Design a protein around this ligand. Structure first.
Ligand SMILES: *C1=CC(=O)N(c2ccc3ccc4cccc5ccc2c3c45)C1=O
Ligand SMILES: *C1=CC(=O)N(c2ccc3ccc4cccc5ccc2c3c45)C1=O
Ligand SMILES: *C1=CC(=O)N(c2ccc3ccc4cccc5ccc2c3c45)C1=O
Ligand SMILES: *C1=CC(=O)N(c2ccc3ccc4cccc5ccc2c3c45)C1=O
Ligand SMILES: *C1=CC(=O)N(c2ccc3ccc4cccc5ccc2c3c45)C1=O
Ligand SMILES: *C1=CC(=O)N(c2ccc3ccc4cccc5ccc2c3c45)C1=O
Ligand SMILES: *C1=CC(=O)N(c2ccc3ccc4cccc5ccc2c3c45)C1=O
Ligand SMILES: *C1=CC(=O)N(c2ccc3ccc4cccc5ccc2c3c45)C1=O
Lengths: 123, 123, 123, 123
């Protein structure tokens, strides 16, 4: 149910909406800058945002081109996210392996000092 | 038993030595460059190195200043190693936490695609 | 309950909120300038601010990084406040001591004139 | 059994070694230039080189990074060799085909003269 929302604060946002008796929920909202798509709330990790219907100006069905652009944007963002996750996987694996290798070639007294220092760190 | 070793290849190396009937073992060897101390074998992680006595020119007891410098050098190296280990601990902890936070705010389909992609990676 | 508030006047403010049936209270509110945190009401000394729910656009849970930055900002502000209080303590103590020392080395007639002048001041 | 060998001629060479009672064999030896890996004996086609143990200074186990670099170097060299073999296969096939085509369009007297000339060549 991809639709365009007009907010009271002269804002146009496209997203997948679900309508209830008094309030509506929106997913993957994007503000439209005359086109440029920008994340509506780049401060939260919530999947959906609830909003009262009293702050609604117009609800409408967008054009096919807008829907296609919205789909492409979301797909590109998700692909970037999964690529970043894979990159972080590889980086953390490499770092852990090299750190373990460094830890292996240590001295008993140095190991005890490291343990005490880490205990003081966590203190 | 900190002592100075003269090798057949015109080399002077100071280290803690243990003498056996045919071969001798050395720990924390350091070549002396006319003074500059350099690691003797910066390619292995072994704690001690065994060497036949037939390749021995002279064994001798060093001066007090040389022993003090050797002790200071070893202590500084060990302190640097433990500091690096602590730094790596902090870095890997931060990276793992941020990666988990990134993983939390994902989509089910994206998570499935990530799982399949990781399986293909390990393939 | 650190949360992000969207006001009707296109404003985003993070703070510790408490929700009631008709109105909500907020503590340590901070406007977000695209990040920069600014005090929401730098004109009042009240600990909490009450606001009707009819002026609410969205309530949401922020990210971990935002919460950490908010905590650090509040802690830094409180530390600055307590340091300023200590500085003022020291300054007023020094000023009072030096003023008392000045008052000690006076003349009886001058003291009477000072008393009359202070009485006229308060008149 | 990838290990580092110190020779009497102030040389460090890494390779896969096999130890016997009096002599040791080494495969894929590589001199280390402070890192740069160079073929130890770029004059022979022998798979393994035998050497007496009396010319041994130190035998040691290298680090994981050195082993990884050695493996990568050997794999790259083998891939280059097989690629060159394939290139030579293609070149010799093309040359033989074109030479046969040239031989086909000849004259009987010219063919006899060619046969006599080749016989004189081999003489
Ligand atoms: C109320 C305050 C404010 O800043 N608003 C606002 C929010 C978003 C936009 C986006 C684009 C745009 C272009 C020209 C003017 C203009 C004015 C105000 C806003 C704008 C905006 C509010 O709605
Ligand atoms: C994210 C993308 C975007 O365009 N944003 C945005 C939305 C509304 C406004 C209103 C006013 C204004 C003034 C100066 C700069 C600026 C930047 C971005 C936005 C602005 C904006 C996003 O928040
Ligand atoms: C045999 C070969 C070689 O290179 N050697 C060698 C090893 C270490 C050193 C250290 C310092 C130094 C100073 C001046 C000359 C010189 C020559 C050779 C070596 C030197 C070296 C061997 O012993
Ligand atoms: C590590 C420290 C050091 O001084 N090394 C060293 C030992 C022997 C030699 C011999 C010859 C030579 C020629 C050019 C450069 C160079 C650098 C370091 C050394 C050299 C050396 C160590 O291996
Ligand atoms: C209404 C009047 C006004 O001035 N508003 C306002 C309040 C705060 C901000 C903060 C940042 C910002 C950036 C770009 C444009 C813009 C417009 C209006 C405001 C802004 C603002 C009102 O909301
Ligand atoms: C305190 C910090 C801050 O950024 N404030 C702030 C909030 C809203 C606005 C809106 C418009 C405007 C125009 C010119 C200057 C200016 C300065 C600060 C603010 C402004 C603002 C605070 O009040
Ligand atoms: C004996 C003669 C000779 O030339 N040696 C020799 C063999 C290999 C190397 C490699 C690198 C290097 C660096 C600095 C000095 C130096 C000296 C001698 C050799 C060196 C070498 C012998 O060992
Ligand atoms: C192959 C690679 C390499 O580095 N080689 C090599 C080994 C030892 C020496 C010793 C002395 C010397 C003097 C001038 C040039 C030169 C080049 C290469 C080597 C040298 C060397 C190989 O043989």
């Amino acid at each position: 149910n991809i639709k365009i929302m007009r907010l009271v604060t002269c804002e146009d946002i496209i997203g997948n909406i679900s309508e209830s008796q008094g309030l509506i929920t929106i997913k993957k909202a994007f503000v439209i800058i005359p086109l440029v798509l920008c994340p509506w709330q780049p401060y939260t990790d919530d999947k959906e945002i609830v909003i009262d219907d009293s702050k609604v100006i117009t609800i409408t069905s967008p054009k096919d081109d807008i829907i296609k652009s919205y789909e492409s944007h979301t797909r590109v963002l998700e692909n970037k996210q999964v690529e970043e996750i894979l990159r972080l996987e590889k980086e953390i694996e490499d770092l852990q392996r090299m750190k373990e290798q460094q830890e292996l070639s240590l001295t008993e007294a140095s190991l005890q000092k490291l343990q005490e220092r880490r205990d003081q760190e966590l203190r």
